[PDB]
Amino acid sequence: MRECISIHVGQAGVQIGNACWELYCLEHGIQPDGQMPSDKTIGGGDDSFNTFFSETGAGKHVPRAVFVDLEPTVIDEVRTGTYRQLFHPEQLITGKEDAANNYARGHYTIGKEIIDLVLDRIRKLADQCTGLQGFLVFHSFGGGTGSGFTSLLMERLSVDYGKKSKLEFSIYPAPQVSTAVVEPYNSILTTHTTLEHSDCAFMVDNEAIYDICRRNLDIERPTYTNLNRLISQIVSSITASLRFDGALNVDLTEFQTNLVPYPRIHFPLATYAPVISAEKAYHEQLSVAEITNACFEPANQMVKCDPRHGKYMACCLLYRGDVVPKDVNAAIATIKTKRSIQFVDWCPTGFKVGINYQPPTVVPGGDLAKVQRAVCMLSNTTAIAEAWARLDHKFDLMYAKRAFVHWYVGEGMEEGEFSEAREDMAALEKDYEEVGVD
Amino acid sequence: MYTFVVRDENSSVYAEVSRLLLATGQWKRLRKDNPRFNLMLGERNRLPFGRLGHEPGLVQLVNYYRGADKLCRKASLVKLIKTSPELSESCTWFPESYVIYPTTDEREVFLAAYNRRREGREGNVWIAKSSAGAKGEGILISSEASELLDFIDEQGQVHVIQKYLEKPLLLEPGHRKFDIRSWVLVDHLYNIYLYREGVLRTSSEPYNSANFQDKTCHLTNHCIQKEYSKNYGRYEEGNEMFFEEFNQYLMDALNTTLENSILLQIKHIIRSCLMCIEPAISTKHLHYQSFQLFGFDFMVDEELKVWLIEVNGAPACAQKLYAELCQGIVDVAISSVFPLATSIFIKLHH
Amino acid sequence: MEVIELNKCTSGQSFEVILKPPSDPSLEEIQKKLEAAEERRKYQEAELLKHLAEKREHEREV
Amino acid sequence: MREIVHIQAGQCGNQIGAKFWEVISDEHGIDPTGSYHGDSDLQLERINVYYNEAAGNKYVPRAILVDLEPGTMDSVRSGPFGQIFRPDNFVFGQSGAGNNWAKGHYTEGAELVDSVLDVVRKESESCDCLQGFQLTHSLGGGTGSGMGTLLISKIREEYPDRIMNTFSVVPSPKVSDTVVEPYNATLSVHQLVENTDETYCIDNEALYDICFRTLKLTTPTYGDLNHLVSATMSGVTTCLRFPGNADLRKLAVNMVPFPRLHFFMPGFAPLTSRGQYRALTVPELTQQMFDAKNMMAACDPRHGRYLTVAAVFRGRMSMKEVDEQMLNVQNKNSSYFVEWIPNNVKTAVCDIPPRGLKMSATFIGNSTAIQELFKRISEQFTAMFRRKAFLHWYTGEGMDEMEFTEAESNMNDLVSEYQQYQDATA
Ligand SMILES: Nc1nc2c(ncn2[C@@H]2O[C@H](COP(=O)(O)OP(=O)(O)OP(=O)(O)O)[C@@H](O)[C@H]2O)c(=O)[nH]1
Ligand SMILES: Nc1ncnc2c1ncn2[C@@H]1O[C@H](COP(=O)(O)OP(=O)(O)CP(=O)(O)O)[C@@H](O)[C@H]1O
Ligand SMILES: COc1cc(OC)c(-c2coc3c4c(ccc3c2=O)OC(C)(C)C=C4)cc1OC
Ligand SMILES: Nc1nc2c(ncn2[C@@H]2O[C@H](COP(=O)(O)OP(=O)(O)O)[C@@H](O)[C@H]2O)c(=O)[nH]1
Ligand SMILES: [Ca+2]
Ligand SMILES: [Ca+2]
Ligand SMILES: [Ca+2]
Ligand SMILES: [Ca+2]
Ligand SMILES: [Mg+2]
C-alpha cells in the first residue's frame, strides 16, 4: 500500500474536495464521526482505502487531505459542517484576504507569505506515509488562489518531492457560473507555470457540467452544490482504483503510463454516463451497451469538443456496477463499426478496462438517481485542444489592449510573463495539431 | 432579432444570402470578430469550429460541415471511396482512380492496371488532377502513362490519376462534350436537398479523341471555354445548357428523359456519398449545428451512365438561379433554425 | 478483438482489449522569482509615496 | 470579516450619507438606537461589513462624519438615525469652505484633516481585515470636494494597499449653488483619477432630468434627488451586505481594465418618487436599466461603448429569466459592448428586496460615454477660465493659475483616453 495526499486550493478546490470526501466516506462506509465499523484492523491497516485515509488509535479514519484558501469563509464551512469531525485543524489552512481573482496576487504577493506554512502542513502528512505516491491537486483555473497559489505549490512540490507524481483536477472557466472577466489570464498563466510540474490533469469545464445538470437533472439554474456532486461522482470513478482492490490504475504512475504517452499532452478527456435525475418517477435502467455508447457523445463529456475531429492516444473505460467483460467487448465491437474512432498511428487501437462491482454511490437527497451500472471514459484525445483554442482566443482579445494587465503588474509581475505564458500555449496548440491532424 | 457574421468575402452565394437576410428586417449583421452571432457564414480555410457553440444562450449555426473536406478534396475523395465499405474498392459510379505522391502511395497499382490495359488494346488514356489547379491549370490528359507521371513529379502537390472517360455522351448539334453540376444543400438535421435546377457546363469545341493535349475540346469548366475557345457561346448563353433544354433534347434525340436516364443515378450517388460521411460530420447532437451547400460534378458516358468526378465544397451558382437557390438556403437551412414572423428542392430520403 | 491481462478479484476485474496494432527549477530559483517581484512592488510603492510627498510639499507651499 | 470604513464629507456628502445609513439600517433591521429587531439572520451575516458591534447588542455604523461647518452635521444628529452614529466620529470645524476647493484642500481643510485621520485610524485598527474605504461627497462645493480629495490623498499615503472608492456627486447648472462648481469639480476629478479605485458618478443633471421628466416632479428638491441616490447606494452595496464571494478589490479587478477609467454610470429600476403596487417584470427591470432614462449620469450609452457592466437584481425572481433577459438586451445593444473584453456583462440576484419594492435592479456601467459628463464639466470650466473669471477666490488662498491649467489638461486627457477605447476594435 502506497499513500496519496489530496490538496484542495481555493474556493472551487475546497468545495469540490468536500463533495469528494463526503462521497468517499459513503463509499467506504465511514461515518461523519470518522468511525469505520467495517475496518476490523483497529488503529491501522494497509488496505486500499488506507491510500486516502489514515487511522487513529481511537479508530478514526482521517483524510490524507490539506485544504488551503487565502481567505477563510469557504474552509470555515468545512470546520462547521457535517464532516467537521473528520479533519484536524492543521489540515485546514486559511489566510486572511484573498487573491481577488488576480493570478499575480495568489502567486507572488500573498503566496510568498503562506507557501512555507503550507509545505509544512503537507510535510506533516507525508511523515505519516510509509510509501507516499504523490499528490492530487484540486483547483480552479479562474480564481486568483486556484490559479496563482496552485502553480507556486506545484513548483515547490517538484522540489521537495521530486520523484513523486502529481495529478490535477482543474475547473476550466465558464461565463455562465462566473462573475469574473480576467479568468482567461489566470488560466493561461497557471497552465504555463504548472505544465512541466503536472504528470496528468483532468480538466472539467463548468459549461459542460452546468449543461449536464440542466439537461439530465432538470435543474433549471444549477448551483455549485449541484455541479460539485456531479463532479465528485466523476472524480470518485477516476480515483476508485486507488481506493479499491483491482489491477488497473492502481498507482498514480499508472495514470501517466496508461493515459499520457507525451508529457506535455497530459489532459485526458473524461466522459461519464449515465446522469439520471432522482425525481424521475419511472426510469428504464441503461445497459452496458447504452452507457458505453454514451461515452462517445459530446453531450456527456467533461469538456465539450468533438473527438471525431482528432485522434486518440489512449482510452480507459471505468465501470461501476453490474458489468462483465463480455458485454463490454460486445459494446466496443458494435461501437467501433459506427463511430469515428481514430488512433494515432504509433499507438495501439484499444481500450484498457476496469470494472468494479459496487454500483455508484449517490449522496442521499442529492440529485443523482442510483443506477445499476455506470462508466467513466478517460480518453487522451487531441480534440480537447479545442478548449485551449477557446481560452487562448479570449486571452488574445484582451491582451492586445492590455486590458486589466495593470492589476497583475501592480502585484509584482512583468508583462513578459503574459507573452511567455501565451507562447507556451501557442506551442501546446501546435503540439496537439501535429499529433492529431494530417 | 437574429444576428449573423460574414467571413468569406469572395462567396457569390452567401453574399446574396447576406442581402436576403437583411432585407427580411429580422436579421442584424455584426462584424467578423463579434462572437454573439446566431449564424456564421464562415471562411473556407481553418474556420474555427472549436469556438462555436460556447456562447451562453445563443443558438449558433455555421454554413460548413467540419470534416466535409474528406469529400471535397480530390486526393481524399479517392481514399474515402476505396476505404469505406459503404462505397468499396469497385464502386460502380466513380472512375478507377489512384492517389499518387510526387518526389499510402499507389504508384505501383496504378501501373498494374495501366499495363493490363496496354496489352488489352483497350482504351488507356488517363487524366491527373489536383485541388490546387485553379482556373484550368495542372491537369494532363495522356494516353501514355509516364508522360503524366513525370508531369506529376515536376510540381509538389499530391495528385490523383484517374481513367479518362474515353466515350462521353456528345450533344448535337456540335459533337460537343459536357459535365453536369448539381447543387445539394444539407441542413442541420442532415436532410439532403437537391436543387431541382442543375446546369450542363459545355464544350464549345467539338470533341476530338485524337489529340488530347488540346484541351478546350476535353475540359468543360466555364472559364477555360470563356477564354481559350473560339466557338464560345453559339448554342446557349455562356456554355450553360439547363435541364429543360437538355431534357427536351434527350427526348427528341434519344427517346428518354433526364430523370430516368441520368438523375436517378445522380440522386443515388449524392445519397451514397453523403450518407457515408454522416457519422463523421453530423451535428445532430452537437453544441453547434452545421449546414453546407455542395456542388457535385458528374460526367455522362455514351451509354447514359453517370460518373462522379468531383465534389466541390465552396461552389458558385449559375447567374440565372442565384435568387431562387439563395432564397432556398434561407428558407430551408436558416429559417428552419431561426424562424421569422411548393418547394425548389428534392428531398433525398434515407 | 483480442482480450489480454484479465485479472479478477471479489471487488471486480480488469483487462485490455486491442482492436488493431500500431503502424526542475531549484528552490533557490523560485525564491528568487518571488523576491524580485516583491522588490518590484516595493519600488512601485516607493514611487507612489515619493509622488505623495511631492504633493504634501506643494500643499505646504500653497 | 471584511470591514468597510465610511466617510461622509460636506453638506451633500453628509445628507446622502445619512440617507444611506437610514436605508441600509432598515434593511438590516437596525433601529435608530442601534438595536437589532429583524426577522431573518440573512440580515446579520454581513452586518459587520458596515457596522461595529458594541456590548448591549448594539450596532454602530463604521462611519466618520466630516464638515468644515457644523450646520449640516447638527441636522444629522437631529435626523431620524442621528443617534446611531458614534459621537466621537463627528469631526467638524467652524469656518466653512465657501464653495471653495482651495479652502477645503489647502487652507481651512488642511487645519482639520489630521483630526479626521485620527478617527479613521481608530476605526481601521479595530478591523479584522479592512476591505477599504468609501467616501460620499459632492465635487461642486468646497468641503466634500476639496477637503474630501485631500482626505483621499492622506488615506492613500497611510493605507496604500487598501481600496478607496467613492460616491461622487457631480455639479449641474440645473441644480446649482454657485458659478464656481465647474472649477471645484475639475480640480477634484483629477484627484479622483489618481487616487480612487472606483468612483460612482452621481450626476445631479441626470437626477434632475429624471425627477422632472419621468417622475413628473415639476420642482425637484435635494430630497427628491437623494431618494434616487439612496436607492442606488443600497443597490450597489447589496452584494457586500448580504451573502453572495467578492470583496471591493475583486469587484475592482473585474470592472476596471485601465486604471484611470474607473468612473461608473449608475442606474436604477424602477424609478420612483417618494410616496408602487405593480411589481415590475424581469423584462421590464432589464430594459429600463439599460435605457438612457434610468441613467444617473447624463451620458448617452449609445454614444459610447461598455467596457464592463454589472447588474444586481433584488427580489424573489427567476435567475433563469434574469440570465435570459440579460443575454437578450446584449444583442439589441450588441454593438455597444466592446468585443475585446469577453463576457464583460455580469449579474447577481439577491432575494431580499429593498423596502417598498418587490422587484428592483441596480446598474453599474463602465461606459466610455461617461466622457460626455467630463466634456460638459470641462466646457463650463473653460468658459470662465479663458477670462480667468472668479479665480481671485482661489488665488487668494495661495493657488496659482498653473494648477488650474494642469487640472484642465488632465481632464481633457481623460476625455481623450475614453475616446481611444470607444473606437478600439478586435
Ligand atoms: N465547479 C465549481 N466551480 C467553482 C466553484 N467555486 C468557484 N468556481 C469557479 O471558479 C472560478 C473563480 O475562482 P475561485 O476558485 O472561486 O477563486 P479562488 O480559487 O478562491 O481564488 P480567489 O480569487 O483568491 O478567490 C469561477 O470561474 C467559478 O465558476 C465550485 O464550488 N464548483
Ligand atoms: N475521368 C474523366 N474523364 C473525362 N473527363 C474528365 C475526367 N475527369 C475530369 N474531366 C474533365 O476535366 C474537367 C476538370 O475536372 P475537375 O471538375 O476536377 O476540375 P475542377 O475541380 O476545377 C471543377 P470546379 O471548378 O467546379 O471545382 C471537367 O470539367 C471534365 O470535363
Ligand atoms: C465606492 O463605491 C462602490 C461602488 C460600487 O459600484 C458602483 C461597488 C460595486 C458594487 O457591486 C458590484 C457588483 C459587481 C461588480 C462590481 C460591483 C462594484 O463595483 O458585480 C456583481 C458580481 C454583479 C455584483 C455586484 C462597490 C463600492 O464600494 C463600496
Ligand atoms: N444631490 C445633491 N447635491 C448637492 C446637495 N447639496 C449640495 N449639492 C451640490 O453640490 C455642490 C456643492 O457642494 P455642497 O455639499 O453644497 O458644499 P460642500 O459642503 O463644500 O460639499 C453644489 O453644486 C450643489 O448643487 C445634496 O443634498 N444633494
Ligand atoms: Ca484498517
Ligand atoms: Ca516532476
Ligand atoms: Ca483657523
Ligand atoms: Ca497627528
Ligand atoms: Mg476565493
Ligand SMILES: [Mg+2]
Ligand atoms: Mg474543384
Ligand SMILES: [Mg+2]
Ligand atoms: Mg451647500
